[PDB]
Design a protein around this ligand. Structure first.
Ligand SMILES: [Mg+2]
Lengths: 185, 246, 230, 230, 230, 230
């Protein structure tokens, strides 16, 4: 946009299924490396998990005391259950709609994860709720932890370029979150 | 020999859901079927079980469990009705401590990936011991129905084929202690919702080896005992003769 | 003519637990026979008497009790004897009986020493009545009801917890249940210091069960706790 | 004998709160169901203690936590008072159904069709009124008075010998038909207002379905559900 | 034989006028209760001739003389027709409860839970309606017709052998638990309108609870209450 | 014995939805009927499983596909649940009629006149009110309560020995009276609101007629209807 974003946001939507059962420590190290890096207090971030209940594990807050308390919760999340990636997106879309009632032009960044991909009808609602999140004014980045399908996460994100493998993920998203930060206020 | 629910689990009438003569026998009925099972180490946590589905093991050959001419009789008959007889050995020495729980669980789906269809043989070698997570305690991993795009998919929070891991001693069981025995002897009869179930798709029993006390041994002493088992069907009644299953 | 009937004050009332039948709608059905199934549960006291594992805080709880080599004048484990206590939630005593209202009988803790074979020692098993303060000292454990369990031929001891109560039945979901506190205390004490042989692991584990006695009886079914499903 | 299996499950309890039909129904199409299928959802009560979804037998039980707008919500039923006291595998009993209205002064009527049969889904034009084909049939369509309660005892009709409380086989072929019994039900009921389809109202009237298991028989001792420690 | 104890207390009389539930209740928290506790007050009738306060057994009886605004008033019940003819100490009898509506054409329903058990206080979402967990259970939830009366006879369920009309001990430890028996009750009832919580109305509907003591047995001759001389 | 003929047809099923009389009727004139005949159509239920038209026995069964405006539509009834299981030619049974109202809180009344008799169609002026001649008679005029159901069992009254399910002769002479039995009926019923003709309302109230064949006897094995292959 022409005007800079008065508030900047960041949504960590993390899979905690039985398919990430051996790779949660790789996911939590990816979240902490994006949380303890961006120490700027203008960033309001949120921690969303999904296995069966799409749960907001940390609300949309900015202060680094609650975020460090939130990362104490993510370190003890035992993986287990199904993969409802459409309910990880409803927790984002019930926060974008709650924060579009102010007047600012903000920016919401979505980070989604999966090792074992979804069933045929679980993918359909996740495609619908990602469209629900895109229509509310967000940008979706489907970060890929180990072996997945590049085509399947391309329907969730904006395009196939927004999907990154997690070993390239912090290589990518170090400057992609920073891409808006060199355009923001 | 821990007989189950009767004095003699060999006693079994022919099924009342057939009009033909049952194939009561086959070419080697007084022999056992020995298969490997994954070794028990120190890193195995408490309640990390390992399920051997019967007769799901004769088909997938879980641990080299070759069924000989019982699998080749099960594939050539539609309805099958037998009572099992397992025998798990594990060479517990004086130098080990710990206690397995060998049970014969009725009607559970413990070989099923809490996230899909049925387990392969490579994936039984990768994990080696199925950890008792929140899914296996709440039954949240028996396979969910494909509802379709119309119905909104509900949050599946429970399923009746759980394991309550603290209650597995209600089943026909013997505890493979470090200082009472080295092998168990369980003999179970036929059960089922019908007088005889199918052959390719029945799971009426399940051999279940659960670690109650984790293995501890001194370094340099006897290390990592192997677990074998020996399944043997007692009085089968094969109905519905047809050709080999496709 | 017509029989003159005066209908009562509870007419047209569907009561849930009315001990009587109703009109058959689709009668004359010959059900398929169930003679082939073995093990018919006639009575659910056939499963309170089956010894099932207990739980211990050290949602990852532990059925056994670790035995540290430090000899000490305090109990190795001491849990209260209450069927609402969370060392009984996943037994078959405390899970069947929690869905009822009253019980009467003898809880039967079956022990199992899962240590090495050449271990030698004694254990003291003191059940206490409900006192104002929990007994801790082994001297406070000898004065209660005790039984000395040796690691000899007995690698499995079934300590029958007595039934001592001022009422014929006990409230089965209640912390207090009685005069001031906590309904009793089983306590496995170690009596002599345990000789574990070298090149055999130190810190053995004792595995606890919880069955019910032969005189265990239950009463008054209540609507259960449906919070297993969330 | 309050732990008696024939005594314990012989009492009325809630199963499902189903909506009352006001036209000729379309029975819910089997799984998977694609979008755009015009049908009638949640009007049918599959009479089974096992978990259901969309009036069909389900593997797991699933409720809704945040029921947002996209998609059609599904009537999932479960017998909460059963599984907490169902420490067994098989359970044959004769069902006693009671259908209590949840609408002030409702005249409803309760259909039924056995285990394995299907709903008759059309309408015949009697006197230029669409009278549906669930007013007639050889199965019990009990009629309620204005403000009354429908009650009848149903037999064990299914082709299975017993109902598996826990089942591990596969009804159809494998890959997500594990642990899904096909013929474990006493049938299905549904409520309908006994007026033709041109008198279809606008309100959505609910009704509640109770269940009593007459002559309960249970086999093969098994577990009870896991109680958490939080 | 009109002075016969089995004949004299064998007649119906008023106990309490309790309010009818219209949602999933919160049972009154035990004493002392601090301010700001969100709960549901006076909806429960503790079935006992002894004095009660906030649906829990009380030591004394206390009414209100000038009920001003500050604080929550407490439903205190007493059996006035009992103690004036209770010249004895202990009293075991089987209770007969009759619940008469004090609202014109009310459809209510009467729950119950035994002596020592507790109310099940939550709700399950059936068909996007909050149906509470007091519609189901193993305890009698009798349902009334529209304008009818609920009546049933309850047994002596408590774990005490008899009900102390006069009691001098201490249930818990001392310092204001003297003369307060804990297990002297036939249970507790409560009325609920059998509609889900989204159909909660605005009016506060009352109901009245009667009591008949079937098969009265009295022991240990004692005093009668003091009549004044004014 | 669920295939027993005495058991299979011994259950209630719908026959016709007839309109309720509110004046002295004119019975439908026999076929052919020219235009301009003032009469009362569809108010009479000819109690027969065979097809009817205009409350008279018909050869074929005929419904309407595109019921346009010109002409008077005719109440054609058939017992759908009969002929699909009527693999026989003759059928004598005693009829059990149940008349269920399809109007909220209707007070109706059910006349009857036997096989071969006719409706009495006039009115006598009682107290300056036209009371019709179907309030009186030697035949059963059962009266319903306000919101009730009329039920009675009718005998095999007809002069035929049995009812031909299939008939091939000619009742009158030939040329379109082939296959049309004249005396195959248990009679005819009709509903009337028991108020005189000056209190005739404006709405057109319907009512539904059920049928149970008590003591069914079937002779001469014959075919079942042809099921299509589309
Ligand atoms: Mg997964």
């Amino acid at each position: 946009s022409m005007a800079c974003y008065g508030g900047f946001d960041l949504y960590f939507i993390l899979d905690k299924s039985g398919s990430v059962l051996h790779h949660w420590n790789e996911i939590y190290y990816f979240v902490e490396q994006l949380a303890h890096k961006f120490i700027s207090p203008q960033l309001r971030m949120s921690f969303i998990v999904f296995s069966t209940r799409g749960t907001t594990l940390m609300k949309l807050t900015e202060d680094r005391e609650q975020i460090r308390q939130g990362l104490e919760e993510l370190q003890k999340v035992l993986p287990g259950g199904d993969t409802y990636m459409h309910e990880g997106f409803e927790r984002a879309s019930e926060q974008i709609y709650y924060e579009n009632r102010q007047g600012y032009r903000t920016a919401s960044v979505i980070i989604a994860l999966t090792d074992g991909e979804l069933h045929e009808d679980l993918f359909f609602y996740s495609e619908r709720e990602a469209n629900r999140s895109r229509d509310l004014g967000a940008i979706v980045y489907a970060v890929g932890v180990k072996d997945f399908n590049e085509t399947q996460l391309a329907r969730i994100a904006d395009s196939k370029d927004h999907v990154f493998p997690v070993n390239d993920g912090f290589q990518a998203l170090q400057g992609i979150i920073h891409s808006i930060l060199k355009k923001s206020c | 020999v821990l007989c189950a629910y009767v004095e003699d689990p060999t006693k079994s009438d022919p099924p009342s859901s057939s009009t033909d003569q049952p194939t009561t026998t086959f070419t080697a009925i007084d022999r056992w079927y020995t298969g490997r099972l994954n070794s028990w180490t120190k890193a195995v946590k408490t309640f990390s079980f390992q399920a051997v589905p019967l007769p799901g093991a004769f088909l997938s050959r879980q641990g080299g469990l070759n069924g000989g001419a019982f699998t080749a009789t099960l594939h050539r008959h539609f309805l099958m009705k037998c009572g099992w007889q397992v025998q798990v050995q594990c060479n517990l020495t004086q130098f080990h401590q710990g206690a397995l729980l060998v049970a014969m669980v009725p009607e559970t789906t413990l070989d099923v990936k809490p996230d899909g269809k049925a387990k392969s043989l490579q994936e039984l070698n990768e994990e080696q011991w199925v950890e008792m997570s929140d899914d296996y305690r709440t039954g949240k991993n028996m396979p969910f129905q494909s509802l379709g795009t119309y119905y909104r998919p509900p949050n599946w929070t429970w399923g009746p084929n759980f394991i309550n891991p603290y209650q597995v001693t209600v089943f026909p069981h013997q505890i493979l202690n470090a200082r009472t025995s080295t092998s168990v002897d369980i003999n179970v009869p036929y059960i089922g919702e019908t007088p005889t179930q199918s052959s390719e798709t029945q799971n009426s029993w399940t051999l279940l080896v659960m670690v109650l006390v984790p293995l501890d041994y001194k370094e340099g002493a006897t290390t990592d005992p192997e677990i074998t088992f020996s399944v043997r069907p007692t009085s089968p009644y094969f109905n519905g003769l047809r050709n080999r299953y496709t | 003519g017509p029989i003159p009937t005066a209908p009562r004050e509870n007419s047209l009332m569907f009561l849930s637990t009315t001990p009587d039948d109703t009109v058959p709608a689709y009668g004359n059905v010959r059900t398929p026979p169930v003679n082939y199934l073995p093990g018919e549960i006639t009575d659910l006291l056939q499963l309170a008497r089956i010894p099932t594992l207990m739980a211990f805080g050290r949602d990852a709880y532990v059925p056994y009790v670790a035995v540290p080599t430090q000899f000490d004048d305090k109990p190795l484990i001491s849990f209260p004897i209450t069927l609402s206590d969370p060392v009984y939630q996943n037994t078959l005593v405390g899970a069947i009986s929690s869905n009822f209202a009253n019980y009467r009988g003898c809880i039967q803790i079956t022990l199992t020493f899962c240590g090495p074979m050449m271990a030698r020692g004694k254990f003291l098993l003191s059940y206490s009545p409900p006192n104002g303060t929990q007994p801790q000292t082994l001297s406070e454990a000898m004065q209660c009801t005790y039984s000395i369990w040796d690691i000899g031929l007995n690698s499995s001891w079934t300590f029958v917890i007595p039934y001592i109560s001022p009422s014929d039945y006990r409230e089965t979901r209640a912390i207090t249940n009685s005069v001031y506190s906590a309904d009793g205390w089983f306590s496995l004490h170690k009596l002599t210091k345990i000789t574990l042989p070298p090149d055999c692991p130190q810190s053995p584990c004792i595995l606890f069960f919880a069955s019910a006695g032969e005189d265990y009886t239950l009463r008054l079914p209540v609507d259960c706790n449906p919070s297993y499903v969330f | 004998n309050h732990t008696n299996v024939k005594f314990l499950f012989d009492r009325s309890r809630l199963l499902n709160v189903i909506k009352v039909l006001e036209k000729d129904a379309v029975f819910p199409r089997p799984f998977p169901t694609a979008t755009g299928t015009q049908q009638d959802d949640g009007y049918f009560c599959l009479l089974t203690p096992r978990p259901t979804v969309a009036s069909r037998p389900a593997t797991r039980f699933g409720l809704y936590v945040s029921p947002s707008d996209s998609g059609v919500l599904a009537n999932t039923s479960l017998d909460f008072n059963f599984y907490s006291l169902a420490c067994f595998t098989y359970f044959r009993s004769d069902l006693e159904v009671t259908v209590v209205s949840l609408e002030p002064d409702l005249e409803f009527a309760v259909g039924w069709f056995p285990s394995g049969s299907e709903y008759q889904a059309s309408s015949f034009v009697y006197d230029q009124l669409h009278v549906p084909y669930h007013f007639t049939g050889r199965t019990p369509r009990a009629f309620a008075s204005k403000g009354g309660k429908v009650s009848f005892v149903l037999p064990w009709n299914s082709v299975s010998s017993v109902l598996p409380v826990r089942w591990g086989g596969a009804s159809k072929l494998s890959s997500a038909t594990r642990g899904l019994p096909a013929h474990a039900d006493w049938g299905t009921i549904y409520a309908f207002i006994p007026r033709p389809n041109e008198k279809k109202s606008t309100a959505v009237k609910h009704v509640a379905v109770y269940i009593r298991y007459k002559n309960a028989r249970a086999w093969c001792p098994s577990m009870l559900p896991f109680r958490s420690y939080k």
